Nucleic acid binder design. Structure first.
Lengths: 48, 79, 126, 99, 136, 182, 49
RNA sequence: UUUCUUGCCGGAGGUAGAGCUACUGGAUGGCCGAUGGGCCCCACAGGGUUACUGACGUCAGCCAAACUCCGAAUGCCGGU
RNA sequence: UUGCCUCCUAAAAUGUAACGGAGGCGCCCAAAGGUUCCCUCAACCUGGACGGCAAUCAGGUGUUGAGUGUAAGUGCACAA
RNA sequence: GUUACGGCGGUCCAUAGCGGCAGGGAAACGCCCGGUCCCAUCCCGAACCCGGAAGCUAAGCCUGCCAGCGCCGAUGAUACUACCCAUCCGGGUGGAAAAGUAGGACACCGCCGAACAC
């Protein structure tokens, strides 16, 4: 893994709208994102 | 009404100069060729213009390696 | 009913390693006076072998398989250093001081360099 | 199903080659080589007229009993070299047919 | 007519009229055939004439094969020109025919009509030619 | 220690589920997803080469590592292409980053897709790999929708050790990919 | 022109040691390159005259 | 006798011959089967329907001087 | 047309003529030279919004194909 | 001395390849897990390194068998041809070509290391 040519990559936590948490690394430096639908609440996954 | 042809380069007098079994001196030209029709074998070098020459004294031999014809020099026993 | 389709990375690595070894062998060859130190480096062990490509006959050989090298603790590089020392000693014994080193289609960044340096300090010209 | 093999006298060849074959054809004998699983190619001369008659009466796939100096050998006409102009059988490749 | 779509070299040396034909010497398509007995540069015009003769003799039924193709260009220099000043332009398209070569083949139910049509073709041709048959 | 959500799920449950479904003679046949390749082919770079920089930045922000700029091995005049013109960007993800990108792509992006009705599970390679294309690039939080430039039909593909379409679909369903079952 | 026969002269011995072609369009500026000055007996930087 | 003749031995060739599904340019058939035009079922989903223009491919068959998967005889170069 | 290079003619060493059959030229490259190391697709499928005869792409084999500063003999997954 | 165990090297480099069927892990050849350690990605620990045996012969590896594809391939004959004979034809002496069937072949040896019994 190269030293600095590789862009930063920090672990982050996200919370969906239905209230499901999620932890994963993403380019977002803030570390706290707010996702709306997510796959735990999307209609396609849930049913119908 | 004439011909667009009529040109031709000098014959380059290529080919094998020392054939199998001929005793040659070191540095002797063995094959004048374009490309490696024959490849440099043992005690045989390849010139800039693809001229195969003997690197050591001996007798010219023609062999085959990996399906490629090669020119080798077999050392000649001292008398 | 399972049929492999992808060329396994092991097979790719073997084919490419043989490819690189032949590429090197175009210029590197062993002789009675200046043998060829072939190196085979696996994920487990490292082996080296002084070949005379004129006869295809080996004069000396060393391996990490040996009980001595296995007893030697440390790292893979330590074992490769011991193997290099062993092959240098055995080349001395066989009467071989200068050879050509065949890296077998490998790189600096591993055991090959360590073995090479082991033979250097041992006394072989490699 | 099958049929009686056609009898043909096929003397062995004392001399073989281009001149020998041409002389045999001039004499009126088609040269032939009999080979097969026995692994023993034999160089024979079949009477040209009789051999051609057998071929044209029973076809190329006609089994032949060749009398080769007394011995009888079954063989089928594996191949026929025929001259395109003279239309004569230049040569016969016979394949032994063990029964 | 029969003319190649293209030729790699349009000014070729004359085909060597030597030896008997080594290939195409038997009827491989039809029942009857016309076997050449002499060497000749059979031109595309001669091929056209022979095939038209065969087709017009057999009228309605039957099938005709033309084994030889005139893909060899014989050149001709302009009229009343002296020797030299290059090679002439392609003039004729010929098939190098050798003895033993089967030039045309015919399938037709009536043997007499087939032979008469092949005889027409032979008369159109510039060589000695015989009617050979598939049955050997 | 640390372990991606999807990677841990695969190491703990998915292998057993796939073994039970497609009982293999040996454990090593258990399909295991391999490098994930995400690409943006510009095509119009011949007219606006600047788009390559935006594609590079977007791919970096989406994946986590720099995108390799891929030139053209051919020069077809029909589209105004010459040998060496940067014509796309490619990112290969392997290991922890691969699994984390898969986890994010399944848990964040695809649900955020506009009018998302899933993709038919017929785009599999026929040898075990699955390729599809995202209709935009704003579904990823790293690509903030407020500062986007244009739409880039984003090619994605996942390479697996599967042997064919069946094992590939089994693996991806186990990983939990949306599928427009048909 | 186009590819003039430029003359590479050393910086130290200042001897016009070599002559070689160079495409003035691709390399308009004087060709500075390491070469062997026999007067100096060693490799020295040579540049176009 | 280094010359030459003959025998034998070592040698490189791409000619004559052919062979071409071995390359680069060709040849009668039908074939899973390309644009399929055409009947359309009447889907713009999707599909047989191909009387005829007939893709790749395939079947014995054929040619070349600037074709060669091959390949002599002579000639030539050496040694004896 | 005149000099040079390549091929065929040229008759398998070399050489071989014609106002014989074809072409090239007479430049270009400072990174297309040296060295060291490494590689790897020619075309069907699934596809890959757009992006079919094409993309960034992914797999398999096509077994050495394929293609490769400027025409013959060479060089390949021993890589000129 | 032996093994379906290993590497290293072997031929005018396919009679050896491709494909199909069956079999193996004590030690080797592999497979494989996370980046504290050299080193690397025109991005990616995929290729190269670190600690390994918690686990595996699926693949590579190699063993046996299939002649299906490829490969090799006679003898004979013919083509061709050197010389010679021959008024136009043609013939003699010598040399002598692919396909196929007959066929061959699913390759052919030495160095050293491991265990076995001595």
């Amino acid at each position: 893994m190269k030293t600095g040519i590789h862009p930063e990559y920090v672990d982050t936590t996200v919370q969906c709208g239905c209230g499901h948490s999620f932890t994963t690394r993403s380019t977002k430096q803030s570390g706290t994102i707010v996702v709306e639908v997510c796959s735990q609440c999307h209609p396609f996954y849930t049913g119908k | 009404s004439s011909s667009r042809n009529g040109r031709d380069s000098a014959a380059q007098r290529l080919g094998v100069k020392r054939f199998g079994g001929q005793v040659v001196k070191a540095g002797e030209i063995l094959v004048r060729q374009r490309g490696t029709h024959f490849h440099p074998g043992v005690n045989v070098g390849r010139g800039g213009d693809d001229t195969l020459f003997a690197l050591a004294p001996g007798a010219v031999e023609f062999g085959a390696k990996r399906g490629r014809k090669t020119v080798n020099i077999v050392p000649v026993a001292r008398p | 009913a399972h049929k492999p389709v992808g060329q396994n990375i092991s097979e790719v690595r073997r084919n490419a390693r043989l490819r690189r070894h032949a590429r090197l062998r175009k210029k590197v060859a062993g002789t009675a006076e200046v043998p060829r130190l072939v190196v085979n480096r696996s994920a487990r062990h490292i082996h080296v072998q002084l070949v005379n490509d004129l006869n295809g006959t080996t004069l000396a050989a060393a391996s990490s398989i040996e009980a001595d090298v296995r007893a030697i603790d440390g790292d893979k590089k330590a074992h490769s250093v011991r193997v290099g020392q062993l092959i240098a000693e055995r080349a001395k014994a066989a009467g071989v001081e200068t050879v050509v080193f065949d890296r077998g289609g490998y790189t600096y960044g591993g055991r090959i360099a360590a073995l090479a340096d082991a033979a250097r300090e041992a006394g072989l010209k490699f | 199903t099958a049929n009686i093999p056609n009898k043909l006298t096929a003397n062995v060849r004392t001399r073989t080659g281009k001149g020998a074959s041409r002389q045999a054809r001039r004499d009126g004998k088609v040269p032939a080589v009999l080979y097969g699983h026995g692994t023993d190619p034999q160089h024979l001369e079949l009477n040209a007229r009789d051999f051609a008659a057998v071929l044209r009466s029973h076809g190329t796939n006609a089994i032949l009993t060749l009398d080769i100096e007394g011995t009888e050998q079954l063989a089928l006409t594996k191949a026929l070299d025929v001259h395109p102009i003279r239309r004569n059988i230049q040569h016969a490749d016979l394949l032994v047919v063990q029964r | 007519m029969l003319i190649p779509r293209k030729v790699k070299h349009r000014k070729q040396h004359h085909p060597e009229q030597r030896g008997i034909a080594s290939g195409g010497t038997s009827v491989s398509f039809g029942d009857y055939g016309i076997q050449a007995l002499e060497h000749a540069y059979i031109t595309n015009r001669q091929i056209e004439s022979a095939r038209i003769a065969i087709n017009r003799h057999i009228k309605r039924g039957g099938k005709v094969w033309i084994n030889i193709f005139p893909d060899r260009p014989l050149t001709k220099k302009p009229a009343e020109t002296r020797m030299g000043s290059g090679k002439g332009s392609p003039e004729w398209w010929v098939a190098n025919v050798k003895p033993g070569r089967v030039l045309f083949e015919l399938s037709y139910p009536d043997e007499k009509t087939a032979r008469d049509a092949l005889t027409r073709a032979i008369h159109k041709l510039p060589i000695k030619a015989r009617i050979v048959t598939r049955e050997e | 220690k640390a372990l991606p959500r999807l990677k841990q799920r695969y190491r703990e449950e998915i292998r057993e589920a796939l073994q039970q479904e497609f009982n293999y003679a040996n454990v090593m046949q258990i399909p295991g997803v391999v490098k994930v390749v995400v690409n943006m082919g510009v095509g119009d770079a011949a007219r606006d080469a600047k788009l390559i920089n935006g594609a590079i930045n977007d791919l970096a922000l989406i994946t986590g590592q720099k995108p390799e700029v891929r030139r053209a091995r051919k020069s077809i005049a029909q589209f105004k292409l010459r040998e060496g013109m940067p014509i796309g960007a490619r990112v290969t993800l392997r290991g922890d980053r691969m699994w984390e990108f898969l986890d994010r792509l399944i848990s964040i992006a695809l649900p955020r897709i506009r009018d998302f009705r899933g993709l038919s599970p017929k785009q599999f390679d026929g040898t075990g790999n699955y390729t599809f294309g995202l209709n935009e690039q704003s579904m990823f939080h790293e690509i903030d929708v407020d500062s986007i430039d244009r739409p880039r039909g984003m090619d994605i593909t996942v390479v697996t050790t599967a042997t064919n379409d069946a094992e590939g679909r089994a693996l991806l369903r186990a990983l939990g990919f949306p599928f427009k079952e048909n | 022109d186009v590819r003039p026969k430029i003359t590479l002269a050393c910086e130290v011995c200042k001897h016009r040691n070599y002559i070689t072609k160079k495409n003035r369009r691709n390399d308009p500026d004087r060709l500075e390159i390491k070469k062997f000055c026999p007067n100096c007996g060693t490799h020295q930087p040579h540049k176009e005259s």
